[PDB]
Ligand SMILES: [Fe+3]
Ligand SMILES: [Fe+3]
Ligand SMILES: [Fe+3]
Ligand SMILES: [Fe+3]
Ligand SMILES: [Fe+3]
Ligand SMILES: [Fe+3]
Ligand SMILES: [Fe+3]
């Protein structure tokens with residue numbers, strides 16, 4: 001059963017946030033580990049990242065935030081709406097005011113790529129509240145700007161300008 | 172250049188935290204979607220999670236926290252030590268005092284399964300600054316509690332008693 | 343009109359928190375300043391603390407949480423209930439587990455003296471929704487572990503045992 | 514002895530923040546209460562606010578953040594520098610971007626009056642490390658924009674435009 005007392009709820013939320021941070025950091029370290037002359041350290045990094053994922057999933061289930069697929073899609077829709085309507089524009093404008101190139105560039109990349117996720121989730125929710133699965137194949141993702149390309153893949157990136165060969169395929 | 176202003180650094184740290192949380196949530200959503208008759212929505216969730224990973228990696232690179240393997244290995248060691256020694260016993264004590272079965276069980280699993288990551292990382296560091304690669308193969312991870320079993324794997328999980336075949340191998 | 347946007351609401355809440363912390367810090371600084379040989383620096387600290395109070399009051403008015411007293415007492419009642427019931431026992435248990443004399447002593451002084459505020463506020467609210475002011479006089483307070491003594495004053499503080507002459511009277 | 518373990522430090526810092534918030538809220542409620550037909554409610558509000566101040570002071574001393582006046586003034590100097598350089602300009606620009614009148618007005622009042630506090634603290638500090646007290650009298654504070662006037666007080670407020678009769682005297 002979901003926890004009700006406030007303090008244990010706060011503690012579990014903080015634990016989930018920490019475990020997610022740890023898993024993401026380990027994933028980031030693994031890429032550089034495999035990019036250097038130590039191919040077998042990325043194995044350990046990915047295994048322990050999976051362990052942190054398991055811990056975070058256990059914490060998430062403990063709070064009882066998981067339901068059916070339509071509710072998960074609704075939560076994703078709300079999260080995506082908050083990430084490209086309120087947070088990122090303000091962060092980009094603050095970074096412009098303070099005058100630093102890297103933060104402005106990163107938020108520029110992240111600001112223009114999040115507008116599609118909400119549409120995809122809404123389509124999935126409209127097609128999932130009845131008993132049927134959507135049709136999709138060979139989703140392309142950029143490794144430099146995170147740009148969701150569905151089915152067809154543009155020859156060059158309309159955000160950074162990377163060639164189509166550089167993309168990663170999820171099928 | 173690395174971000175030196177305080178407000179932009181705080182903004183980017185919060186954005187990194189949000190992206191990591193979103194990526195973890197999307198991975199959990201995909202895991203749930205595989206369990207129902209929607210194999211394609213799991214693909215969509217995985218692709219969007221990889222996009223969130225790219226966003227968070229760009230945010231992490233902007234802050235300049237990434238370097239060579241010894242430094243991020245030491246960072247992982249510090250994080251694991253902090254997680255095992257201080258936070259988890261306190262959370263377990265608080266959950267025991269308030270009296271939630273789920274929080275106590277999850278914290279018990281976490282504090283009993285997280286003890287080996289620090290030792291593994293500590294050993295690995297003193298070989299990744301001289302120039303060689305670690306000799307570890309075929310790592311095992313439990314899918315319920317998450318206990319890193321290196322090379323050989325026990326017949327049953329000492330923490331939860333899961334069968335051997337349930338283990339997720341990495342090689 | 344009240345502030346409706348989420349991001350700027352969060353910004354104003356954080357600013358209010360910072361102003362309150364600064365005002366508390368200045369009020370604490372003034373007491374030590376007057377304890378030494380500088381009676382004018384205490385005056386400067388008091389004036390600057392009042393300026394911070396004005397800032398925080400403006401921030402509070404902007405967010406729109408201040409209104410008529412009959413409904414205003416409810417926020418204080420809820421805050422006192424949360425402080426006495428949930429937050430403080432957990433902190434006391436954690437400080438006992440980690441083993442710090444100062445934290446345990448401070449929490450023990452805290453939870454045992456915060457119990458009367460909720461009762462006083464409930465009585466004030468249920469006597470003050472008809473247009474009449476409550477009949478109360480000479481509220482006493484201990485200067486070490488403040489225990490809200492109403493009207494009459496005990497000879498010694500039941501919590502710390504301080505003499506009666508040290509009580510700070512309000513009239 | 515100062516608290517050294519991390520979790521107790523976090524808990525005590527959160528408690529201090531909560532107590533400061535409670536004190537400020539109670540002060541504002543008292544000021545509203547005395548503005549209407551109930552005079553004696555403000556007495557109770559101010560008494561319990563003093564109790565919250567005592568609790569916050571105990572928590573602050575527990576973390577051992579208090580020293581002599583020379584070093585005490587440094588914390589105020591740094592706080593004012595951060596408040597007037599980083600936080601308020603960014604908050605004002607964000608409020609301008611989102612387009613709300615109240616937040617822009619409050620931040621405009623706040624950012625134009627905090628520049629003199631750092632100078633006052635520095636002037637007090639240079640005279641404090643030698644062993645003597647500064648000379649100051651009749652400090653005026655505006656009650657609708659927080660504006661520190663030293664000795665002489667202008668006829669009209671150069672920020673809001675209030676007459677010099679409305680000010681409050683801190684002697
Ligand atoms: Fe963990
Ligand atoms: Fe996103
Ligand atoms: Fe791209
Ligand atoms: Fe297990
Ligand atoms: Fe301020
Ligand atoms: Fe209280
Ligand atoms: Fe007492």
Ligand SMILES: [Fe+3]
Pocket residue numbers: 422425456535565
């Ligand atoms: Fe209180």
Ligand SMILES: [Fe+3]
Pocket residue numbers: 364394593596627630
């Ligand atoms: Fe200030």
Ligand SMILES: [Fe+3]
Pocket residue numbers: 655656657658659660670671672673674675
């Ligand atoms: Fe003014």
